[PDB]
Design a protein around this ligand. Structure first.
Ligand code: HEM
Ligand code: HEM
Ligand SMILES: C[C@H](O)[C@H](O)[C@H]1CNc2nc(N)[nH]c(=O)c2N1
Ligand SMILES: C[C@H](O)[C@H](O)[C@H]1CNc2nc(N)[nH]c(=O)c2N1
Ligand SMILES: NC(=[NH2+])NCCC[C@H](N)C(=O)O
Ligand SMILES: NC(=[NH2+])NCCC[C@H](N)C(=O)O
Ligand SMILES: [Zn+2]
Lengths: 414, 416
């Protein structure tokens, strides 16, 4: 019932009792574990043909409110049952309800805290929550997005933020941001099977063209936003260059590195996930914080299905790309992550290396153990793409579950 | 689509379904409400000792199941020999309460247990395994001879060959055949004066135990330990492996001439000897197995782990790296060079070893093979992906389904 969690580096032991508070089931069963799966249709929140049965919405709602009041410590006062009957009443009549700006603020922070795949949750209590639930057009969403960016970037001193657009309603389409991230580089499928730019962004780069975008011819062209208001065709919105803070990549010692022309944006704002608070769902709620050096250095730049530069860098360093035993790949990677850490630091833009990050996650796990009696973590995601064992998280046993409020995955609006 | 776990490879975009998992028989650590897939020893991968023989129906159910697998492998399901063997087994379990495997049945189960090991990334050679029957063994001294024969064969002068030696199974009442060591070849861990540990911290408990049973300890950082073999109901006897048998590799770097000066070294033969081999309900408490090393097991885990040799900082200082700041990636720079040293050394010493890229690239082919063969392959992602350069390796991008298939290598409690 209560999983014994052990750290093999220190022999320390803890029992996760918070997992008992999970109400949403995962993909695993006693017969088999599916923990390494990126997304089963279970953790997904697909569209629907009818409204969520009241009985359920009411219970998830009641729970959230019970959580919120326990947080501000007024758990039990008249204001609690005043808010409980207010929801019970609104639900019984409209079939739904709405959240107060304070409850939404507590909800978004708790969704982050509950995000199993987030290694930066040490900073969960520090989130700027922009209420954009008064949006009605794609043009309004754009304005709301441009403010989110301008603020989050803050000239380089990045700061966590989230803009929450209008919730989903059983009687209409969804407010959606088509791009997976507010800032992404374009991926142009060339003549043969080749790809100019980011291979992960080919599909979206095609859709923008479909909606009249005039495409560039570079590996680092920033994509325009495709914002969609309920039941309306999406709209193309080119982002203001000055808003988009980018960082030219250079190496502290390898002078020729700079000559590669590599660069990466400063803001990691995820815009395709769904935020769920109290049973209500927000199909558009872009959030952002700052980058961990590996997200760019290893994955975005070194993944074989991404920029894939390992070899280019390797031959520049003059490594033996003949056999895998010379470790040219491992070597080239470290230098790339080094170039990233050097560059962002030189450009006075916030980043956190994987050692610093995982170290902070260890303290967070501790704080959470004392706070809630456990902490949901996804080992495969928490452990960095390189130097896994060189970091403390690798040696830490973790328990994974679904706690609400939560950031869920959701279908693409096309 | 198909009502089976859909598996995707994010690098290639290819999808496969796992039908094989349908054949599993034992529950795991996970439940729908929580994934305990990152635990090393959940009480679900362990098989506790038995103060009583397995209930004749359950033991028989596994037996029947194993026999069927055997016949399916030789392509004689439903045949006269198949049905006869089944009767032979339930007949034997009937009068004695247990049964015995046939020579070929054991070779099959043993290779099947390897094939079914979720945490092994070297399963591509599962078919090529030398099974040394040692079910005739009756004494601790005979165990030593067997193990020595094993090390000799498997070491084959740095041209390692996969092998396992199966000692007598667990009989009701009669004590078990146990090798107290975790591996045949293991360095000693001396609990120091200040509190530290000279040698290998992992082996402190066993090193303390060897001393209690009469071992005369040295005081080195790389002292091979003596075997503490135990025959049924008898006390464990100390046995010292002769230096000639224990092949070792002195570590040196291909460019950093000073690395050699570090005096670091590792043994060529990786021989796990504390795991229980389960086949058809029959338990083999002693059955050491070995193959060859994957470079990261030594260069990253054995040498760099904080709770192991922890030589990361030392090498960093020698490379003249700023170990004051995290952002310098000094841990990353040293570890790469240490792993390169391990690779280089074993190559120079003409001892068999495989790097994490090649090892991993070969596990992908094994996966494709096992897809076409059984409709899946139970893999433990956490253990399959190397402790370094994870995403530079293709298995990182491969979703994996993990489940328990019998025969299998399972953990068991320590003899003491
Ligand atoms: C404060 C700085 C932050 C850092 C350094 C950080 C870092 C990370 C990293 C390394 C990942 C994995 C990303 C990947 O490999 O795709 C991640 C995932 C995630 N983070 Fe954070 N995070 C931070 C802020 C935020 C904020 C502000 C939120 C939400 C309000 C958040 C929510 C999440 C969620 C839900 C995921 C899962 C993403 C997915 O499933 O694709 N993070 N974070
Ligand atoms: C042929 C060469 C082989 C290679 C390269 C290989 C490689 C590996 C690696 C890298 C591990 C991880 C061990 C750790 O990090 O603790 C592993 C685990 C394992 N291997 Fe293999 N293996 C090989 C041969 C064998 C053989 C011959 C057997 C058995 C007949 C076997 C059975 C297993 C099992 C059961 C584990 C589980 C380890 C544990 O749970 O502690 N392997 N192998
Ligand atoms: C298949 C596997 O789960 C997948 O490649 C995961 C592994 N761990 C990860 N971890 C993080 N942080 N991000 C990812 O994209 C991945 N991909
Ligand atoms: C806690 C976590 O399961 C543990 O540290 C695992 C991670 N992956 C591993 N992978 C391998 N190959 N070997 C190990 O010992 C581990 N340890
Ligand atoms: N720091 C974050 N919260 N990042 C969210 C995911 C960003 C994504 N991994 C990228 O490389 O763009
Ligand atoms: N290749 C193997 N059979 N490895 C088994 C585990 C060995 C262990 N990781 C070691 O380095 O000693
Ligand atoms: Zn699981």
């Amino acid at each position: 019932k209560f999983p014994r969690v052990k750290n093999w580096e220190l022999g320390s032991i803890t029992y996760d009792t918070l997992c008992a508070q999970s109400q949403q089931d995962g993909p695993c069963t006693p017969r088999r574990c599916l923990g390494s799966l990126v997304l089963p249709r279970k953790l997904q929140t697909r569209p629907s043909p009818g409204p969520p049965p009241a009985e359920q919405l009411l219970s998830q709602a009641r729970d959230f409110i019970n959580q919120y009041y326990s947080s501000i410590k007024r758990s039990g006062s008249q204001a609690h049952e005043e808010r409980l009957q207010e929801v019970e009443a609104e639900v019984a009549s409209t079939g739904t309800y709405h959240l107060r700006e304070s409850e939404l603020v507590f909800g978004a922070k708790q969704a982050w805290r509950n995000a199993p795949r987030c290694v930066g949750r040490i900073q969960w209590g520090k989130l700027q929550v922009f209420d954009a639930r008064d949006c009605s057009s794609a043009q309004e969403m754009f304005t709301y997005i441009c403010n989110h960016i301008k603020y989050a970037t803050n000239r380089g001193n990045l700061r966590s933020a989230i803009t929450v657009f209008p919730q989903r309603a059983p009687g209409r389409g969804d407010f959606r941001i088509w791009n997976s991230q507010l800032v992404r580089y374009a991926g142009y499928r060339q003549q043969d099977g080749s790809v100019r730019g980011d291979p992960a962004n080919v599909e979206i780069t095609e859709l923008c063209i479909q909606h009249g975008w005039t495409p560039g011819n570079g590996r680092f062209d920033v994509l325009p936003l495709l914002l969609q208001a309920p039941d309306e065709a999406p709209e193309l919105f080119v982002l203001p260059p000055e808003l988009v803070l980018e960082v030219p990549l250079e190496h502290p010692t390898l002078e020729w590195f700079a000559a590669l022309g590599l660069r990466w944006y400063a803001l990691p704002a995820v815009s395709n996930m769904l935020l769920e608070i109290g049973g209500l769902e927000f199909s558009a709620a872009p959030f952002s914080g700052w980058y961990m050096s590996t997200e760019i250095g290893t994955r975005n730049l070194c993944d074989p299905h991404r920029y894939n530069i390992l070899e280019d860098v390797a031959v520049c360093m003059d490594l033996d790309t003949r056999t895998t035993s010379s470790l040219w790949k491992d070597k080239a990677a470290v230098e790339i992550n080094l170039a990233v850490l050097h560059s962002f630091q030189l450009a006075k833009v916030t980043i956190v290396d994987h050692h610093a990050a995982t170290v902070s996650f260890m303290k967070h796990l501790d704080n959470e153990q004392k706070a809630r009696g456990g902490c949901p973590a996804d080992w495969a995601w928490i452990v960095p793409p390189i130097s896994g064992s060189l970091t403390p998280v690798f040696h830490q046993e973790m328990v994974n579950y679904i706690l609400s409020p939560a950031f869920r995955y959701q279908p693409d609006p096309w």
